[PDB]
Amino acid sequence: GSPGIRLGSSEDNFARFVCKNNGVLFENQLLQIGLKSEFRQNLGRMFIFYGNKTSTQFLNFTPTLICADDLQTNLNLQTKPVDPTVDGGAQVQQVVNIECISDFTEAPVLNIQFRYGGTFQNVSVKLPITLNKFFQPTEMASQDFFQRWKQLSNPQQEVQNIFKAKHPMDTEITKAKIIGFGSALLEEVDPNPANFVGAGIIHTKTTQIGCLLRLEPNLQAQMYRLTLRTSKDTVSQRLCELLSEQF
Q: Are residues 116 and 210 in the same domain?
A: no
How far, in Å, CA of 242 to CA of 19, rounded? Answer: 9
How far, in Å, CA of 116 to CA of 60, rounded? Answer: 9
Task: Domain of residue 220: give its range.
Answer: 135-247
Phi first, then psi: what are they for 87, rounded to 5°? Answer: -60, 155
Find, among 179, 181, 168, 136, the residue nearest to 15 by Cα. 181
Q: Are residues 100 and 178 in the same domain?
A: no
How far, in Å, CA of 113 to CA of 84, rounded? Answer: 10
Residue type present at position 93:
Q
Handedness of CA 233, 237, 239, 240 (dihedral sign): positive
Which residues are 196's β-sheet partners? 215
86 to each of 23, 47, 94, 114, how far by Cα in Å? 21, 17, 13, 10
Phi first, then psi: what are they for 89, rounded to 5°? Answer: 75, -5
Buried b vs exposed e over 92-122: b needs ≥16 C-beta within 10 Å?
bebebebbbbbbbebbbbbebebebeeeebe
Q: 235: how many CB neighbours lie within 10 A of its CB?
A: 25
Among 105, 134, 163, the domain boundary falls at: 134
Q: Are residues 1 and 114 in the same domain?
A: yes
Q: Are residues 1 and 108 in the same domain?
A: yes
The tally of domains found in the chain comes to 2
**Residue 181 and residue 240 in contact, taking contact as beta carbons nearer than 8 Å:** no
Question: Resolution of this entry in Å?
Answer: 1.4
Q: Are residues 237 and 207 in the same domain?
A: yes
**Residue 92 and residue 58 in contact, taking contact as beta carbons nearer than 8 Å:** no
Give me the CATH number covering residue 228. Answer: 3.30.310.10
Q: Are residues 159 and 118 in the same domain?
A: no
Length of the chain: 247
**Residue 184 and residue 199 in contact, taking contact as beta carbons nearer than 8 Å:** yes
175 to each of 18, 62, 156, 183, 196, how far by Cα in Å? 14, 39, 27, 11, 8
Among 134, 169, 203, the domain boundary falls at: 134
The DSSP annotation for the chain comes to ---S--SSSTTTTGGGGSS---EEEEE-SSEEEEEEEEEETTEEEEEEEEEE-SSS-BEEEEEEEE--THHHHHEEEEE-PPPS-B-TT-EEEEEEEEEE-S------EEEEEEEETTEEEEEEEE----GGGGEEE----HHHHHHHHTT---GGGEEEEEEE-SS---HHHHHHHHHHHTSEEESSSSSSTTSEEEEEEEE-SS-EEEEEEEEEEETTTTEEEEEEEESSHHHHHHHHHHHHTT-
